[PDB]
Amino acid sequence: DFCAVCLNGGELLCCDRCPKVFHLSCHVPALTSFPGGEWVCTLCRSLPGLSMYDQKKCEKLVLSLCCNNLSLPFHEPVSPLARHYYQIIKRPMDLSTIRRKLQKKDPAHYTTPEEVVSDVRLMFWNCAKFNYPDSEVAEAGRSLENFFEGWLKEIYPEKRF
Ligand SMILES: [Zn+2]
Ligand SMILES: [Zn+2]
């Protein structure tokens, strides 16, 4: 009943192989039209810039982040009006920036999975550098990073990073 990424209702696409449902633009990659049917989400699929193999793996990683309820504070960039944020944080990073750079036409498209992982960790580092350690946001960032580091060993057991 609820999009797995933004937790809002409306016109939702169901994945056949898992309970998850998505707004078309909340899925990764975003869909621009509905499918006829028998559709499976990026998490349940099989198989310059990223190789097609790494593209799908990094899409699984980024969608796992977006679908986890702890990622909500990190879905969009911080408002540049936000007091002191852009003075402390010289390299802001957020999941809408990561999503966009996963698109192969993007002029800053990722070329290696290490680049994707470096941005994710940059996001967690900025969170802990700016937010009060007992803020709700800082707690969500620490807990989400533990999820991410676990998925990394699951999706790329071989790579060191
Ligand atoms: Zn959504
Ligand atoms: Zn699924």
Numbering used by the authors: 971 to 1017, 1040 to 1153
Q: What do the paper's sentences say?
A:
We used the mutant TRIM66-MUT968-1160 protein for the crystallization experiment and determined the crystal structure of the TRIM66 PHD-Bromodomain in free state. The 2.1 Å crystal structure of the TRIM66 PHD-Bromodomain showed that the PHD domain adopted a typical cross-braced topology, whereas the Bromodomain adopted a typical left-handed four-helical bundle topology. There was an extensive interface between the PHD and Bromodomain, enabling the formation of a unified structural unit. The results showed that the H3K56ac peptide interacted with the ZA and BC loops of the TRIM66 Bromodomain. Residues F1122, N1123, Y1124, and D1126, which exhibited the most obvious perturbations, were all located on the BC loop, whereas V1070, S1071, Y1078, Q1079, I1080, and I1081 were located on the ZA loop. One asparagine on the BC loop (N1123 in TRIM66) was conserved and played critical roles in recognizing acetyl-lysine.
The paralog of TRIM24, TRIM28, and TRIM33—termed TRIM66—also contains a PHD-Bromodomain at its C terminus. Herein, we determine the crystal structure of the TRIM66 PHD-Bromodomain in its free state and in a complex with the N terminus of histone H3. Our results show that the PHD domain of TRIM66 recognizes both unmodified H3R2 and H3K4 residues, whereas the Bromodomain interacts with the H3K56ac peptide through its ZA and BC loops. Further studies show that TRIM66 regulates the deacetylation of H3K56ac by recruiting histone deacetylase Sirt6, providing the appropriate chromatin environment for subsequent DNA repair and safeguarding the genomic integrity of ESCs.
